[PDB]
Design a protein around this motif. Sequence first.
Motif, PDB file in Angstrom:
ATOM      1  N   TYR A 178       0.828  -1.202   0.000  1.00  0.00           N
ATOM      2  CA  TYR A 178       0.000   0.000   0.000  1.00  0.00           C
ATOM      3  C   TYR A 178       0.863   1.253   0.000  1.00  0.00           C
ATOM      4  O   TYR A 178       0.654   2.164  -0.808  1.00  0.00           O
ATOM      5  N   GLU A 181       2.276   6.858  -6.652  1.00  0.00           N
ATOM      6  CA  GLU A 181       1.264   7.791  -7.136  1.00  0.00           C
ATOM      7  C   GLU A 181       1.541   9.222  -6.690  1.00  0.00           C
ATOM      8  O   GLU A 181       1.343  10.159  -7.473  1.00  0.00           O
ATOM      9  N   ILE A 213       1.233  12.975  -8.337  1.00  0.00           N
ATOM     10  CA  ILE A 213       0.380  13.924  -7.625  1.00  0.00           C
ATOM     11  C   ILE A 213       1.135  15.222  -7.383  1.00  0.00           C
ATOM     12  O   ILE A 213       0.663  16.316  -7.722  1.00  0.00           O
ATOM     13  N   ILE A 231       1.275  23.356 -11.223  1.00  0.00           N
ATOM     14  CA  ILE A 231       0.317  24.448 -11.020  1.00  0.00           C
ATOM     15  C   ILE A 231       1.015  25.803 -11.108  1.00  0.00           C
ATOM     16  O   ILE A 231       0.724  26.625 -11.991  1.00  0.00           O
ATOM     17  N   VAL A 283       2.793  26.768 -14.420  1.00  0.00           N
ATOM     18  CA  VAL A 283       1.878  27.354 -15.393  1.00  0.00           C
ATOM     19  C   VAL A 283       1.516  28.779 -14.995  1.00  0.00           C
ATOM     20  O   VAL A 283       1.422  29.671 -15.847  1.00  0.00           O
ATOM     21  N   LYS A 334       2.762  32.710 -17.268  1.00  0.00           N
ATOM     22  CA  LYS A 334       2.012  33.853 -17.771  1.00  0.00           C
ATOM     23  C   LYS A 334       2.087  35.069 -16.858  1.00  0.00           C
ATOM     24  O   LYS A 334       1.693  36.173 -17.273  1.00  0.00           O
ATOM     25  N   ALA A 393      -4.981   2.003  -3.582  1.00  0.00           N
ATOM     26  CA  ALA A 393      -4.083   3.142  -3.446  1.00  0.00           C
ATOM     27  C   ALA A 393      -4.101   4.007  -4.697  1.00  0.00           C
ATOM     28  O   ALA A 393      -4.103   5.241  -4.607  1.00  0.00           O
ATOM     29  N   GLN A 394      -4.107   3.380  -5.874  1.00  0.00           N
ATOM     30  CA  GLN A 394      -4.214   4.157  -7.107  1.00  0.00           C
ATOM     31  C   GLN A 394      -5.538   4.914  -7.170  1.00  0.00           C
ATOM     32  O   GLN A 394      -5.577   6.098  -7.545  1.00  0.00           O
ATOM     33  N   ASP A 428      -7.515   5.961  -4.777  1.00  0.00           N
ATOM     34  CA  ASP A 428      -7.648   7.066  -3.831  1.00  0.00           C
ATOM     35  C   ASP A 428      -7.039   8.352  -4.378  1.00  0.00           C
ATOM     36  O   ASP A 428      -7.641   9.426  -4.269  1.00  0.00           O
ATOM     37  N   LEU A 429      -5.853   8.265  -4.972  1.00  0.00           N
ATOM     38  CA  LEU A 429      -5.118   9.450  -5.393  1.00  0.00           C
ATOM     39  C   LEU A 429      -5.402   9.860  -6.833  1.00  0.00           C
ATOM     40  O   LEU A 429      -4.917  10.917  -7.265  1.00  0.00           O
ATOM     41  N   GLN A 452      -7.015  13.321  -6.560  1.00  0.00           N
ATOM     42  CA  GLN A 452      -6.081  14.425  -6.372  1.00  0.00           C
ATOM     43  C   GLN A 452      -5.307  14.712  -7.651  1.00  0.00           C
ATOM     44  O   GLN A 452      -5.077  15.879  -7.995  1.00  0.00           O
ATOM     45  N   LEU A 453      -4.906  13.663  -8.371  1.00  0.00           N
ATOM     46  CA  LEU A 453      -4.206  13.869  -9.634  1.00  0.00           C
ATOM     47  C   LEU A 453      -5.053  14.686 -10.601  1.00  0.00           C
ATOM     48  O   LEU A 453      -4.582  15.682 -11.165  1.00  0.00           O
ATOM     49  N   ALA A 506      -5.623  18.376  -9.463  1.00  0.00           N
ATOM     50  CA  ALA A 506      -4.452  19.198  -9.754  1.00  0.00           C
ATOM     51  C   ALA A 506      -4.344  19.498 -11.244  1.00  0.00           C
ATOM     52  O   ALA A 506      -4.055  20.640 -11.641  1.00  0.00           O
ATOM     53  N   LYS A 507      -4.587  18.490 -12.086  1.00  0.00           N
ATOM     54  CA  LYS A 507      -4.464  18.690 -13.526  1.00  0.00           C
ATOM     55  C   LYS A 507      -5.438  19.750 -14.024  1.00  0.00           C
ATOM     56  O   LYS A 507      -5.118  20.513 -14.944  1.00  0.00           O
ATOM     57  N   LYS A 551      -6.852  22.148 -11.889  1.00  0.00           N
ATOM     58  CA  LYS A 551      -6.448  23.383 -11.235  1.00  0.00           C
ATOM     59  C   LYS A 551      -5.361  24.090 -12.021  1.00  0.00           C
ATOM     60  O   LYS A 551      -5.225  25.313 -11.912  1.00  0.00           O
ATOM     61  N   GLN A 552      -4.592  23.345 -12.820  1.00  0.00           N
ATOM     62  CA  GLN A 552      -3.666  23.991 -13.747  1.00  0.00           C
ATOM     63  C   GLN A 552      -4.385  25.019 -14.614  1.00  0.00           C
ATOM     64  O   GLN A 552      -3.989  26.189 -14.667  1.00  0.00           O
ATOM     65  N   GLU A 569      -5.948  28.049 -12.592  1.00  0.00           N
ATOM     66  CA  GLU A 569      -4.983  29.112 -12.348  1.00  0.00           C
ATOM     67  C   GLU A 569      -4.549  29.800 -13.632  1.00  0.00           C
ATOM     68  O   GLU A 569      -4.322  31.018 -13.630  1.00  0.00           O
ATOM     69  N   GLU A 570      -4.440  29.053 -14.733  1.00  0.00           N
ATOM     70  CA  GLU A 570      -4.061  29.656 -16.005  1.00  0.00           C
ATOM     71  C   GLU A 570      -5.014  30.775 -16.400  1.00  0.00           C
ATOM     72  O   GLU A 570      -4.581  31.798 -16.940  1.00  0.00           O
ATOM     73  N   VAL A 618      -5.116  33.843 -13.664  1.00  0.00           N
ATOM     74  CA  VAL A 618      -4.049  34.820 -13.868  1.00  0.00           C
ATOM     75  C   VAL A 618      -4.218  35.588 -15.170  1.00  0.00           C
ATOM     76  O   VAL A 618      -3.774  36.740 -15.262  1.00  0.00           O
ATOM     77  N   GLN A 619      -4.870  34.996 -16.176  1.00  0.00           N
ATOM     78  CA  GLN A 619      -5.176  35.713 -17.411  1.00  0.00           C
ATOM     79  C   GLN A 619      -6.075  36.914 -17.166  1.00  0.00           C
ATOM     80  O   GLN A 619      -5.979  37.919 -17.891  1.00  0.00           O
TER      81      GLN A 619
END
Lengths: 54, 51, 51
Positions: free
Chosen positions: A27, A34, A38, A45, A48, A52, B26-27, B29-30, B33-34, B37-38, B40-41, B44-45, B48-49
């Motif tokens: 685990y 992962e 993450i 974040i 990026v 800009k 385990a995969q 669960d996260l 979050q992955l 975050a992807k 949230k990129q 934020e892009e 900020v624009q």
Amino acid sequence: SKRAFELQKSAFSEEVNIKTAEAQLAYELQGAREQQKIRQEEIEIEVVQRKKQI
Amino acid sequence: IEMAKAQRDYELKKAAYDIEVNTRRAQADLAYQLQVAKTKQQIEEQRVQVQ
Amino acid sequence: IEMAKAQRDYELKKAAYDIEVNTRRAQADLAYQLQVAKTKQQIEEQRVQVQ
């Protein structure tokens, strides 16, 4: 007879404990694997963002 | 003796299956979050624009 | 005299068998720690790869 039984039981307990000890920490291994990606994205974040801010 | 034979035959397979289920859980669960975050990129892009 | 003959014949074999059972039990106890360390190797290998 008691010696034979105890020897066989301890021998079996050996590999059963080995397999368990692998089982709990698989685990954590996958969790760290992962968390690699993450945190990769969590830090992309602000990459990026600052791209800009230029 | 055969009692311990069967105990091994059951416990070893149970642990081997537990390894796989723990890895997949385990995969799973996260993954959330992955993805958050992807996306949230881009959040934020654009946040900020507006600046 | 034959009482002590039989006492020896029993006690010596009991001790000889106890030697083997104690050695195997000692190995079995620490197999768990050996494996948990061997896998903690990879646990740390990835917990530092995140850095």
